[PDB]
Design a protein around this ligand. Structure first.
Ligand SMILES: Nc1ccn([C@@H]2O[C@H](COP(=O)(O)OP(=O)(O)OP(=O)(O)O)[C@@H](O)[C@H]2O)c(=O)n1
Ligand SMILES: Nc1ccn([C@@H]2O[C@H](COP(=O)(O)OP(=O)(O)OP(=O)(O)O)[C@@H](O)[C@H]2O)c(=O)n1
Ligand SMILES: [Cl-]
Ligand SMILES: [Cl-]
Ligand SMILES: [Cl-]
Ligand SMILES: [Cl-]
Ligand SMILES: [Cl-]
Ligand SMILES: [Cl-]
Ligand SMILES: [Mn+2]
Ligand SMILES: [Mn+2]
Ligand SMILES: [Mn+2]
Ligand SMILES: [Mn+2]
Ligand SMILES: [Mn+2]
Ligand SMILES: [Mn+2]
Ligand SMILES: [Mn+2]
Ligand code: NA
Ligand code: NA
Length: 326
DNA sequence: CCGACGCCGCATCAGC
DNA sequence: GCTGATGCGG
DNA sequence: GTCGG
């Protein structure tokens, strides 16, 4: 892409800060800079030019000047050669292993894929499954396959209870031609902000998808959020499709608009949008947008009858999902 | 300079 | 068992 | 690491 070298550098720095340094704000700062640069419609010729963009400061401007001059960043060359940093970074690529578990594993002499495989008993359930499908989870999902997965989820959901509505969100809803995984928002009239009238609303759906061998494993599961693994069925003599991550979030039906804005994202879009709301005197979560009282305490949920209504409250023009890929 | 940086679900642990 | 901190994830 | 105040 236009400034791909810079955004890659920044993304790598972000990862280092999160996984190694354990500095979440630095991680977020770097990702924010990469995101604003990614969107910038000119090929950046200097750090000064980049510094004009919001989120890009003095330190990043300097790194951009070094990157542009040399094609490299010394700081990253160093980090790349450091054994602890490199090991910690790799372990964190397994779902369920974060910065803390990675550093602990590397402490115990567990630091390669092979090491993990021969110490399964040191992993929790999530981590065990993340390792099992490590290779598959590296692969992206063509949109054509997302469409196939959408049909299966939507039709299977209908067979449990025709009152369910399932909406594929995440990168798919933002129009991506390929997705890292599948994200599904689920509703049912028996679960609203004002009561849960049926039990097992999410469970029933997971069971059904498992029953037809779509869902193959579970990373975690509660009453409103399921994290697992799924796989398209392959044809006769046809090689198997990769295993894919799937996230399903059951949302109170009357709070669909807040939930769908939330689950559509992107994650950076959300951080940016929620931060602006705070600046504007509001707080947005997946359920409500609420006013901030003077004390700084949230008040009553404001009326919402569209995604647009939420943008309006905070004085932002509506942005279609495809324009929320930050 | 500096205080804030999105907001919440589920798994695991420490403490009682 | 419960409750609140921490990890890791959406 | 950045930015408003
Ligand atoms: N998972 C879903 C999907 C949608 N709906 C209902 O369906 C309506 C709109 O249908 P749909 O086109 O599928 O969603 P949106 O286009 O995002 O909503 P709208 O066009 O009304 O703004 C929403 O008001 C919502 O009440 C729901 O309850 N649960
Ligand atoms: N830190 C995060 C992570 C995720 N999300 C929400 O959860 C959605 C799904 O998460 P994820 O699958 O990780 O993001 P995608 O945008 O779908 O990216 P990908 O193509 O890799 O799946 C995001 O889009 C966003 O709406 C969020 O609010 N904050
Ligand atoms: Cl930090
Ligand atoms: Cl480099
Ligand atoms: Cl360093
Ligand atoms: Cl859909
Ligand atoms: Cl709320
Ligand atoms: Cl769109
Ligand atoms: Mn992904
Ligand atoms: Mn996704
Ligand atoms: Mn996801
Ligand atoms: Mn597989
Ligand atoms: Mn703003
Ligand atoms: Mn996290
Ligand atoms: Mn400033
Ligand atoms: Na700037
Ligand atoms: Na991980």
């Amino acid at each position: 892409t236009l400034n791909g070298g810079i955004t890659d550098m920044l993304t790598e720095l972000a990862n280092f800060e999160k996984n190694v340094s354990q500095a979440i704000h630095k991680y977020n700062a770097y990702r924010k800079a990469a995101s604003v640069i990614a969107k910038y419609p000119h090929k950046i010729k200097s750090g000064a030019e980049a510094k004009k963009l919001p989120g890009v400061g003095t330190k990043i401007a300097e790194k951009i000047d070094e990157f542009l001059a040399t094609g490299k960043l010394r700081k990253l060359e160093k980090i790349r050669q450091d054994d602890t940093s490199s090991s910690i970074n790799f372990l964190t690529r397994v779902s369920g292993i974060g910065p803390s578990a990675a550093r602990k594993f590397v402490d115990e002499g567990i630091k390669t894929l092979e090491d993990l495989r021969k110490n399964e008993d040191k992993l929790n359930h999530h981590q065990r499954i993340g390792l099992k499908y490590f290779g598959d989870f590296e692969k992206r999902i063509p949109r054509e396959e997302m469409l196939q997965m959408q049909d299966i989820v939507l039709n299977e959901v209908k067979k449990v209870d025709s009152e369910y509505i399932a909406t594929v969100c995440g990168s798919f809803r933002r129009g991506a031609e390929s997705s890292g995984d599948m994200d599904v928002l689920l509703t049912h009239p028996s679960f609203t902000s004002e009561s849960t009238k049926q039990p097992k609303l999410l469970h029933q759906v997971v069971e059904q998808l498992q029953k037809v061998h779509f869902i193959t494993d579970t990373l975690s599961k509660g009453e409103t959020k399921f994290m697992g693994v799924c796989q398209l069925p392959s044809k006769n003599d046809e090689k198997e499709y990769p295993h894919r991550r799937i996230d399903i979030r059951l949302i109170p039906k009357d709070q669909y608009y807040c939930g769908v804005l939330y689950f559509t994202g992107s994650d950076i879009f959300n951080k940016n949008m929620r931060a602006h709301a705070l600046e504007k005197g509001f707080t947005i979560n997946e359920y409500t947008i609420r006013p901030l009282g003077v004390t700084g305490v949230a008040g009553e949920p404001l009326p919402v009858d569209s995604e647009k209504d939420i943008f309006d409250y905070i004085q932002w023009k509506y942005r279609e999902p495809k324009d929320r890929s930050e």
